Amino acid sequence: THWGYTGHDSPESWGNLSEEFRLCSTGKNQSPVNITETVSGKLPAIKVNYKPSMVDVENNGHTIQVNYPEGGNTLTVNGRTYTLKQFHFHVPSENQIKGRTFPMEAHFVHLDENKQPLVLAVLYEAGKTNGRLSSIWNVMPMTAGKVKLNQPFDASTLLPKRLKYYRFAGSLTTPPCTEGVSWLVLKTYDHIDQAQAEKFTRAVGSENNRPVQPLNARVVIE
Ligand SMILES: CC(=O)Nc1nnc(S(N)(=O)=O)s1
Ligand SMILES: [Zn+2]
Numbered sequence: 001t002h003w004g005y006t007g008h009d010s011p012e013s014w015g016n017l018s019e020e021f022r023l024c025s026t027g028k029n030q031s032p033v034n035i036t037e038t039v040s041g042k043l044p045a046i047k048v049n050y051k052p053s054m055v056d057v058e059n060n061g062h063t064i065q066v067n068y069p070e071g072g073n074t075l076t077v078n079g080r081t082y083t084l085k086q087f088h089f090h091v092p093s094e095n096q097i098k099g100r101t102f103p104m105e106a107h108f109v110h111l112d113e114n115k116q117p118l119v120l121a122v123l124y125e126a127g128k129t130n131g132r133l134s135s136i137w138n139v140m141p142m143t144a145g146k147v148k149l150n151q152p153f154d155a156s157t158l159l160p161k162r163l164k165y166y167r168f169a170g171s172l173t174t175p176p177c178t179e180g181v182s183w184l185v186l187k188t189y190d191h192i193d194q195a196q197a198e199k200f201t202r203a204v205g206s207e208n209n210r211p212v213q214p215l216n217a218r219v220v221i222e
Contacts, residue, residue: 003175004062005206012211014175024177030213031119031170031183032094038166038222044078046120046163046184052152059141062174063088063208064200066136066153073155075110075120077184082110082118087155091200093123094173094209095185102189103197105209106158107173118182120165122158127191132157137196142203160188167221173210187222 001018003009009017015025024030050073058065065088073084086109093105104124111117124130139147164187171179201207 001175005208005210014177017175021175021177023171023179024175027171027177027179027213028216029169029171029179029218030177031173031181032096032210032212033168033170033183033215033218033220034096034099034212035166035168035185035220036098038220041167041221043165043167043221046165047076048156048159048163049074049076050084050154050156050159052154054149055153056146056148057136057139057141058146059144059203061144062204063090064136064140064203066155075108075118077118080112080116082112084155085109085111087158089200090173090209091197091204092207092209094212095121095123095183096212097123101209103194104192104200106190108155108159116182117180118184119170120159121183121185122160123186123189124192125189126194129193130191130196133192133196137199140199140203158190160186160190162188164188164222168215168218170218171213 055066065086067086071083075082090105093102102123103126106122108120165184168183170181170183171177
């Protein structure tokens, strides 16, 4: 079933597009969120074990995704190890800090060995060109499709050395809006060109951020 960010199948209507998408409207622990008030807590430190891999670059209609057909890129937090599957982008950002929307956001999507999902998010301010992303931007499929990149890509370069994060629980930001997703949002921001942002939008065909959702019961730790 088709869905999107504009027109008549937009995010406020995702719930009634089918029965399997119904948590997009009835869920109480949904992403993204406006992080406004937090609780200052002793969060467990992130350990990134990312290395170069032979990735491919896909345009799936809704985003530009970079898929990892093997394990090997992991991140460890609080004892559990999480395998990176794919990372991808929203322009503009989905999550907000104090009502601030950033020109782009990245989502590094993982499963531990229980299939318990974790999203690690990087936020992009407007700034100089992103040298480390230009490898992906060059081959970026400008319609639905897939290119195997034939030079190794290193996702370690897309994460900061300073790894403080905001921690909450949430959902996918795309249908079926499944819950049980751990959200870690990094505090140190990366940077993108105005042109890299336009180009993404040109490829994907729209602004691909879901509107922010109520926190309800949820507390955000920082
Ligand atoms: C099948 C699948 O993996 N779907 C998703 N992955 N990441 C998502 S996002 N916008 O929540 O981070 S939705
Ligand atoms: Zn996403």
